[PDB]
Design a protein around this ligand. Structure first.
Ligand SMILES: CCCCCCCC/C=C/CCCCCCCC(=O)OC[C@H](O)CO
Ligand SMILES: CCCCCCCC/C=C\CCCCCCCC(=O)OC[C@H](O)CO
Ligand SMILES: CCCCCCCC/C=C\CCCCCCCC(=O)OC[C@H](O)CO
Ligand SMILES: CCCCCCCC/C=C\CCCCCCCC(=O)OC[C@H](O)CO
Ligand SMILES: CCCCCCCC/C=C\CCCCCCCC(=O)OC[C@H](O)CO
Ligand SMILES: CCCCCCCC/C=C\CCCCCCCC(=O)OC[C@H](O)CO
Ligand SMILES: CCCCCCCC/C=C\CCCCCCCC(=O)OC[C@H](O)CO
Ligand SMILES: CCCCCCCC/C=C\CCCCCCCC(=O)OC[C@H](O)CO
Ligand SMILES: CCCCCCCC/C=C\CCCCCCCC(=O)OC[C@H](O)CO
Ligand SMILES: CCCCCCCC/C=C\CCCCCCCC(=O)OC[C@H](O)CO
Ligand SMILES: CCCCCCCC/C=C\CCCCCCCC(=O)OC[C@H](O)CO
Ligand SMILES: CCCCCCCC/C=C\CCCCCCCC(=O)OC[C@H](O)CO
Ligand SMILES: CCCCCCCC/C=C\CCCCCCCC(=O)OC[C@H](O)CO
Ligand SMILES: CCCCCCCC/C=C\CCCCCCCC(=O)OC[C@H](O)CO
Ligand SMILES: CCCCCCCC/C=C\CCCCCCCC(=O)OC[C@H](O)CO
Ligand SMILES: CCCCCCCC/C=C\CCCCCCCC(=O)OC[C@H](O)CO
Ligand SMILES: CCCCCCCC/C=C\CCCCCCCC(=O)OC[C@H](O)CO
Ligand SMILES: CCCCCCCC/C=C\CCCCCCCC(=O)OC[C@H](O)CO
Ligand SMILES: CCCCCCCC/C=C\CCCCCCCC(=O)OC[C@H](O)CO
Ligand SMILES: CCCCCCCCCCCCCCCCCCCC
Ligand SMILES: CCCCCCCCCCCCCCCCCCCC
Ligand SMILES: CCCCCCCCCCCCCCCCCCCC
Ligand SMILES: CCCCCCCCO[C@@H]1O[C@H](CO)[C@@H](O)[C@H](O)[C@H]1O
Ligand SMILES: CCCCCCCCO[C@@H]1O[C@H](CO)[C@@H](O)[C@H](O)[C@H]1O
Ligand SMILES: CCCCCCCCO[C@@H]1O[C@H](CO)[C@@H](O)[C@H](O)[C@H]1O
Ligand SMILES: CCCCCCCCO[C@@H]1O[C@H](CO)[C@@H](O)[C@H](O)[C@H]1O
Ligand SMILES: CCCCCCCCO[C@@H]1O[C@H](CO)[C@@H](O)[C@H](O)[C@H]1O
Ligand code: NA
Ligand code: NA
Ligand code: NA
Ligand code: NA
Ligand code: NA
Lengths: 273, 273, 273, 273, 273
C-alpha cells in the first residue's frame, strides 16, 4: 500500500486502524469545532451594534473568520468520517481510500483567510502610536502568507520525508516569530492612552494570542513530540492533533474575537461593561 | 461481533435488531429535536428587541445554544439512519457498520457549548446580591466542563466496562450537584428586588432546570434502570433514551430560554407581556 | 415480504410498485410542499413590521411553524425518493429497503410543534371575553398532544392491525373534537366587539381551520376510504394521501397565517387594510 | 427498456445517450438557473426599502418566487446528474434508473407558487382604472392553476401518448390565452395616469411577459418542433429544452421583478432612479 | 479510453492519475475559493450602510456576485473530489467516471452573472462624463456575453480539437479587448471630478482589473503554455489552472468589490478612510 506524501493519520489508519474511542472522538471534536464557529458567527453579527461605529468592522471581520472556519471544519468533519470505515472482523476503523486520504492541508489554505483577518482586525480597535498602520498590516499579511504556505508544503512530507517536514517547518517558524514580534508591538501601542480596563484586556489578548497560535506548530509536530515510535505516533496522537487544532481554533478565533469585542465596548463612548 | 467500547444501541442493533416502530420512532424524535432547535433559533432572534438592551445578550446566547443543538441533533438524526439498515429476510433494522457505530458522545462534547452558555445567560437577566458574577460564572464553567468530560469518558464503557461506566458517572454527578447548588443560589439572589411576577418565573425556571438537567443522567443510566436483562436493555430502552434526550433538550434549552425571555420582559422598564 | 408495522405505501411499493406518474407526482407534491413553507417563512419574516407590536408574535409563530414544516417536508421528500427505486425489467418503482421503509410518522411528531403553535398564535390577535387565555392555551396544548400521540401510535398499524388503527384513530378523533370545540369558542369571543372586516376574516379563518384540519384524519383513513381492495388501496391512494397532506399543510399553516396577518392589520391602530 | 409515461430525455438517454457537451451543458445551464435565483433573492430583499412602503409587497413576492425557483432548479440540477451516468466503453452518458427517471414535472407543480405570485405582484405597483383588484387576482389565479395542472398531466404523455400530450396542451393553451388577455388589460390600465417613463417600463414588461411566458409552451413542444424524428428529437433537443426553461425562468422571474422594482421607484414619491 | 470533447484534467486523470499533493491541493484551493466568496458575501452585506445610499447598490451587486461564485465554486469543489478516486495499488487518484467527467465550463456559464454585474457595479460608484450609462452598460453586457459564450464553446475542444480551441479562444479575446477598452474609458471618466485619493483607488482598480481578468484566458491556455508535451500538460498544469482561477476569482470579485467599497467611502459625504 503506497500512500505517498500523506498525513500520518492515514498510516495509522491503514496499519493499526482506529478504536471506537479514537475514531468517534476525532469525529466529535471536529463537530464541536464547526458548531462553535457557526454559533460564533451568530454572536458576532448579533452584537455588532453594541459598540461604536468605528469598532464594528472588527465584529464584521470576526464574522468573516467564523464563516471560513465553519465551512472548513464542517468539510473536514465529513472528510474524517469518509476516510475511515469500520472493519467488522477486528472492530476497528481502517483507511477507506474510496473516501480520499485524510489531509490537514485543508486547514492551512483556509488560514490564508483566517490569519490575515485576525491580525488585521485588532487594528480597528486599538490605535497605533509609533507604528504605521499600513506597515503593520503589510508585515502581518506577508509573513502570514509565507508562514502558511511553507507549513503547507511541509506537512505533505510529515511521513514521507522528515527532513523536508522539519526544514519547511523551521522556515515557517521564522515568519511566525516575526508575526509574534509585530503583534506584541501592536498590543503595547494599543495600551497607550486607554483605560486600565482596556489595558487588562489587551494583556489577556496577548497571552491568548501567544498560547493559541503556538498550538498550531504544536499540532504540526504532534506525531513526533514523543520521538520515533513514541506514544503519540499512534491513534492517541491522531486524537491529540485534532484536539489541539480545535482548542487553538476556538481560542484564536472565537475567544480572541470576544476579547476584542469587550475591548471595543470599554473604548466605546456610549457603552459600559 | 467485536464492537469494543460502543454504546448499547449498537449491541441491540447487532443482535436483536430494531422493529419498524423502534427504528422509525428514534428517527422521528431526533428529527423533531433538530426542528425545534431551528425554530427556536428563529424565535430568539426575532424577539431580541422586545426586551431592554441590557437583557438582549440572553436572547443572543439562547440563539447560540440553538445553533449548537440544531447542528448536533441534525447530525445525530443522520447518524441514526446511516447506522442501522433494514434486513428484508427478518424485517428488522440491524447494525450497518459501514455507517459507523452510533455514539451518543456527539451530544456530550457539544454540551461544552450548551452547558456553559445556558448557565451564563441567566446572569444577564437576574442581578446577584452577595455572590460575585465572575465567581458564579467560573464555577459554572469549571464544574460544567468536568461534569461533561467525565460523563463523556464514562459513556464509552456503558457496555464494555460497567464499573468504569458507574465510577466516571459518579464523579460526573458530584460536579452536577455543585452546579445545582450554585444555580439555586443564583435563582434566590435573582428573586431579591424584583416584582412577584418575576419571582414566580424564576421559581418555574428552577423547577424546569432541576428536572430537565436531571433527565441527562437519566439517559446515561437508561439501559440499566430496570437492572440486568431488564425491560430497558432492549429497543424499548433505545427509544426511551432518545425520547428523554429530546425532552431534556427542548426543556433545558428552548423552554428555559423562553422563560428567561419572559422574565426579561417583566424586568423591562417600558415593555410588557 | 416481512414489513411488520409499516405504512401501506411500502406494501403497494413492495407488491405492485409505482408507475412513473405515481412515483414522480408524490415526489413533486412533497417538493412543492417544502418550497411553499420556505417561501412562507420569508413572507412572514418580511411582513412582521406591517402590524402593531402586539400582533407581531403571530408573524413570529407563523415563521416558527414554517421552519418546522419546511424541515419536515424536505426530509420526507428525500425519504420518498430513497425508499422506492426503479426496476428496469418492469418499469416501475419498487420498495428499496436500503433506503428505509417510508413512514408518515415523521409528520406526526413534528405536529408537536405545528399544532400547539398554530392554536396558540390566534390568541395573540383576538381578544377573549369570557374564556381565560392560559386555560384555552392549556386545553389546546393538552388535547393537541394527545390527538397527535394517539394518532401516531395508530398509523403504525394501518396495515398490520386494522383494529388498533381504528381504535387509536377514534381516541385521537375525540381530542380533535375537543380542539374544534375550543377553537370555535375562541373565534366567537374574538368576533365580539371588533370591526366588521375583522369579523369577516375570523369567519373565513374558522371555515379554513375546520376543513384543513379535517383533511389530516382524511389522510389517516385514505387507503380504506374506498373499503377493502378499493380504488384507493393502490398507488392512486398513495398519491391521494400526500396530495391531501400538502393541501392541508398549505391551508392550515400558510393560508391560516396569512389570514391571521390580515386580521392583525385590520385591528392595527397605526395601519390601514 | 420499459419507461412508460416518461419524458423524452429518458428515451434519448436510454438509447443514444448524451455526449460530454450535451450532458455537461444541461448540468451547467440548470446550475446557472438556481444561482441566478438565489442571487435574485438577495437582490430583492436588500432593495425592499428603496421603494415606498406601498410597493414593497412586490419586492417580497419577487423574493417568494426566488425561493421557489431556487429550490426547484437546485433539486432539478441534482436530478439531472443523478439520472445519467457515463459509460466508459463508448464515452457517453446513459439513463441510470437507480437515480430515478428525469421528469420536468417538478417545475410544473412549483409554478403553482411562481405563476400566481408573478401575476399578483404587478397589482401592487400599477393602479387599475376599470378592473377590480380582487377580480383580476381571482382570474389570474384560477386560469393559472388550470393552465399548470392540465399541462402537468399532458407532459407525462409527451412520448407515450402524443394525442393526450397535444389535447391537454391545447386545453392548457386556452387558459394561457385568458391570462395574456387579462395581463394586457392590467398593463394598459397601469399606464393610465403615470409618467411616460413608467409607461415605457410597462411597455417593456409586456414584451418581456409575452415572450418569456410563451417560451414555456415552447419547451413543452420542443422535442417535436422539428417534427417526427427531427433534429430536436435528440440530445440537441434536450439541451434546447433546458436552455429555453432557463432563459424563460430568468426573464419571467428575475428580469420581470427588476422591471417592476424600477417601475415602483419611478412611482415612488421621494426616490430617484 | 474514450472521453470525447472533455477537459484535459480527465485525460491526465485517466492516464497518469494525480499524486496525493496534486489531488489534495486542487481540492484545497477550490475549498478556499468558495470559503472566500461566502465570507465576502457576509462582508458586503454587513458594510452596506457604511456608504451613502447612492453607492449601496454596488455593495448589493458585490453580494450578488458572491452568491454566484460561492454556489459555483462549492459545486466545483464537490465535482473535483467525485471525479477522481484513489487507486490503492499505485497510490494515485484516477478518473472515476461514475462521478462524471470534470469540466471547467461550470465556471463559464456562471460568468453570465459575474461578468455583467462586476462591470455594471462600478457605474454606481463613479460618475461618467461624456459617456452614457446605458451605452456603457449595453456594451459591457453584449461583449461580456459573447466573450463568455465563445470561450465556453472553445474549452470543450481543448484536447479534442486544438484548432477549434484556438479559434473560439481568439474570437473570445476580441470581445475581451473591447471590454478592456470600455472599462479604461470608464476609469478615466470616473477620475474626473473626484479627490486624488479616489483617483489613486481607481488607478489600483484598473491594474487589478487588467491583471485579474487576463488570468482567465491564462487558465484557458494553461495546459499548452509550455507547448506540446510541456511541463504544464500534466498534474502540475491541472494544479496551476485551478490556482490561477482561484487567484483570479478572489481578485476580480472580492478585492475588486473591496476597492470599489473603499472608493464609495471616500466619495461619501459623511464618511472617510
Ligand atoms: C477539583 C478537581 C477534581 C478532579 C477530578 C478528576 C478525577 C480523575 C480521576 C479519575 C480516576 C477514576 C478512574 C476509574 C476507572 C475505573 C477502571 C475500572 O473500573 O476497571 C475495571 C477492571 O478493569 C475490571 O472490571
Ligand atoms: C468549547 C468552548 C465553547 C465555546 C463557547 C461558545 C461558542 C459560541 C460563541 C458565543 C460566544 C459567547 C461569549 C459570551 O457569552 O460573552 C458575552 C460578553 O462577555 C458580554 O458582553
Ligand atoms: C515547528 C517546526 C520547527 C522545526 C524544528 C526543528 C528544525 C531543525 C532544523 C532542521 C534540521 C533538519 C533535521 C533533520 O534533517 O532530521 C531528519 C532525520 O535525520 C530523520 O531522517
Ligand atoms: C493545551 C494543550 C492540550 C494538551 C493535549 C495533549 C497533547 C500532548 C502534547 C504534548 C505532550 C508531549 C510532550 C512531551 C515531550 C517529551 C519528549 C520525549 O519524550 O522525547 C524523547 C524520545 O522518546 C527520544 O527518542
Ligand atoms: C520545538 C519543540 C520540540 C520539542 C519536542 C521534544 C521531542 C524531540 C524528540 O523526542 O527527539 C528524539 C528523537 O527520537 C530523535 O532521535
Ligand atoms: C414539542 C416541542 C414544542 C416546542 C415548539 C417551540 C418552538 C420554538 C419556540 C417557540 C416559543 C413559544 C412561544 C412563546 C411565546 C411567549 O411565551 O409569550 C410571548 C411574550 O409574552 C411576548 O408577549
Ligand atoms: C465521588 C466524588 C469524587 C469526585 C470529587 C469531585 C468533587 C467536585 C465538587 C465540587 C468542585 C468545586 C471546585 C470548583 C472550583 C473551580 C475554580 C473556580 O471556580 O474559582 C472561582 C473563581 O476564581 C472566583 O473568581
Ligand atoms: C450517574 C451515575 C451514578 C451511579 C452511581 C452508582 C454507583 C457509584 C459507586 C461506584 C460503582 C462501582 C460498582 C462496580 C460494579 O457495579 O460492577 C459490576 C460488575 O462487577 C462489573 O460488570
Ligand atoms: C442513582 C441510582 C438511580 C436509580 C436506580 C434505579 C434502578 C433500579 C434497578 O437497578 O433494578 C434492580 C434490578 O432488578 C437488580 O438487577
Ligand atoms: C378511556 C378510553 C377513551 C378515551 C377518550 C378520551 C376522550 C377525551 C375527550 C375530550 C378531552 C377533554 C379533556 C381535556 C382536559 C384538559 C386539561 C387542562 O388542560 O386543564 C385546563 C386548564 O388547566 C385550565 O386553566
Ligand atoms: C379517524 C379514525 C376514525 C375511526 C372510526 C371508527 C371508530 C370507532 C370504532 C372502533 C373500531 C373497531 C372496529 C373494528 C373493525 C374491524 O376490525 O374489522 C374487521 C376486520 O376483519 C379487521 O381486520
Ligand atoms: C369519537 C369517535 C369519532 C369517530 C368519528 C369517525 C368518522 C368517520 C369518518 C369518515 C367515514 C367515511 C368512511 C367511508 C367508508 C367506506 C368503506 C366502504 O365500505 O366503501 C364502500 C365500497 O366498498 C367501496 O366503494
Ligand atoms: C375547455 C376550455 C376552457 C378555456 C376557457 C378560458 C377561460 C377560462 C376561464 C374564465 C373564467 C373566469 C375566471 C373564473 C373564476 C374567477 C372569476 O371570474 O372571479 C371574478 C370575481 O369573483 C368578481 O369580483
Ligand atoms: C402548446 C399546445 C399545442 C396544442 C396543440 C397543437 C397541435 C395542433 C396541430 C395538429 C397536430 C396533429 C399532428 O401533428 O399529428 C402528428 C402525426 O403523428 C404526424 O403525422
Ligand atoms: C472576430 C469577430 C469579433 C469582433 C470583435 C468586435 C468587438 C466589438 C463588438 C461590438 C461593438 C459594439 C457593440 C455594441 C452592442 C450594442 C450596445 C450599444 O452600444 O447600445 C447602447 C445604446 O445606444 C444605449 O445608449
Ligand atoms: C465560426 C467559428 C467556427 C470555428 C470552428 C473551427 O475552428 O473548426 C476547426 C476545424 O474543425 C479544424 O479541423
Ligand atoms: C499569478 C501567479 C500564477 C502562479 C501559477 C504558476 C504557473 C505558471 C504559469 C505560467 C508560466 C508559463 C509561461 C510560459 C513561458 C515558457 C514558454 C515555453 O516553455 O515555450 C514552449 C516550448 O519551448 C515549446 O516546446
Ligand atoms: C505569459 C504567458 C506566456 C505565453 C507563452 C505561450 C507559449 C506557446 C508555445 O510555447 O508554443 C510552443 C509550440 O507551439 C509547441 O512546442
Ligand atoms: C501549486 C503551484 C502550481 C505549480 C505546481 C508546481 C509544484 C508542483 C509540485 O509540488 O510537484 C511535485 C509533485 O507534483 C508531487 O507529487
Ligand atoms: C502541543 C503542546 C504545545 C503547547 C505549547 C504551549 C504554548 C506556550 C508558549 C508561550
Ligand atoms: C428517565 C427517568 C429519570 C430517572 C432518574 C434517574 C436519575 C439519577 C441521577 C443521579 C444523580
Ligand atoms: C411574440 C410572442 C412569440 C415569442 C417567441 C416564442 C418562441 C417560441 C419557440 C421556442 C424556441 C424554439 C427553438 C427551437
Ligand atoms: C522537533 C521534533 C521532531 C523530532 C523528530 C523525531 C524523529 C521521528 O522518527 C520517525 O518516527 C516514525 C514513527 O515513530 C518512524 O516510523 C520513522 O521511521 C522515523 O523516521
Ligand atoms: C445505578 C444503576 C446501575 C445498575 C447496574 C445494573 C447491572 C447490569 O448488569 C449488566 O446487565 C447487562 C444487560 O442485561 C448484561 O448484558 C451484563 O452482562 C450485566 O453485567
Ligand atoms: C373508513 C374506515 C373503515 C374502513 C375499513 C375497511 C376495511 C379494509 O379491509 C382491508 O382492506 C385491505 C385493502 O384491500 C385488504 O388488503 C385487507 O386484507 C383488509 O383487512
Ligand atoms: C404541434 C407540434 C406537434 C407535432 C407532433 C408530430 C410529431 C409526432 O411524431 C412522433 O415523433 C417521435 C420522435 O420523432 C416518434 O418517436 C413517434 O413515434 C412519433 O409519433
Ligand atoms: C498559444 C498557445 C497555443 C500552443 C499550441 C501548441 C499545441 C500543443 O500540441 C498538443 O500538445 C498536446 C499535449 O502535449 C498533445 O497531446 C497534442 O497531440 C498536441 O496537439
Ligand atoms: Na466512517
Ligand atoms: Na437506515
Ligand atoms: Na428513487
Ligand atoms: Na451523472
Ligand atoms: Na475522490
Amino acid at each position: 500500500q503506497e500512500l505517498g506524501n500523506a498525513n500520518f493519520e492515514n498510516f495509522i489508519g491503514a496499519t493499526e486502524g482506529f478504536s471506537e474511542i479514537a475514531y468517534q472522538f476525532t469525529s466529535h471534536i471536529l463537530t464541536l469545532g464547526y458548531a462553535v464557529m457557526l454559533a460564533g458567527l451568530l454572536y458576532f453579527i448579533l452584537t455588532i451594534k453594541n459598540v461604536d461605529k468605528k469598532f464594528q468592522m472588527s465584529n464584521i471581520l470576526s464574522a468573516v473568520v467564523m464563516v471560513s472556519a465553519f465551512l472548513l471544519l464542517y468539510a473536514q468533519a465529513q472528510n474524517w468520517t469518509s476516510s475511515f470505515t469500520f472493519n467488522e472482523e477486528v472492530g476497528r476503523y481502517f483507511l477507506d481510500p474510496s473516501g480520499d486520504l485524510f489531509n490537514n492541508g485543508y486547514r492551512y489554505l483556509n488560514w490564508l483567510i483566517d490569519v490575515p483577518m485576525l491580525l488585521f482586525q485588532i487594528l480597528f480597535v486599538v490605535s497605533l502610536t509609533t507604528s504605521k498602520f499600513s506597515s503593520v498590516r503589510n508585515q502581518f499579511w506577508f509573513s502570514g502568507a509565507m508562514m502558511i504556505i511553507t507549513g503547507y508544503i511541509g506537512q505533505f512530507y510529515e511521513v514521507s520525508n522528515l527532513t523536508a517536514f522539519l526544514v519547511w517547518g523551521a522556515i515557517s517558524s521564522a515568519f511566525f516569530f516575526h508575526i509574534l514580534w509585530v503583534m506584541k508591538k501592536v498590543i503595547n501601542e494599543g495600551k497607550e492612552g486607554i483605560s486600565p480596563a482596556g489595558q487588562k484586556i489587551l494583556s489577556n489578548i496577548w497571552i491568548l494570542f501567544l498560547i493559541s497560535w503556538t498550538l498550531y506548530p504544536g499540532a504540526y509536530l504532534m506525531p513526533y513530540l514523543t520521538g520515533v515510535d513514541g506514544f503519540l505516533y499512534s491513534e492517541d496522537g491522531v486524537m491529540a492533533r485534532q484536539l489541539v487544532y480545535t482548542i487553538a481554533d476556538v481560542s484564536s478565533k472565537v475567544i480572541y474575537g470576544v476579547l476584542l469585542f469587550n475591548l471595543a465596548i470599554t473604548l466605546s463612548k456610549n457603552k459600559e461593561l
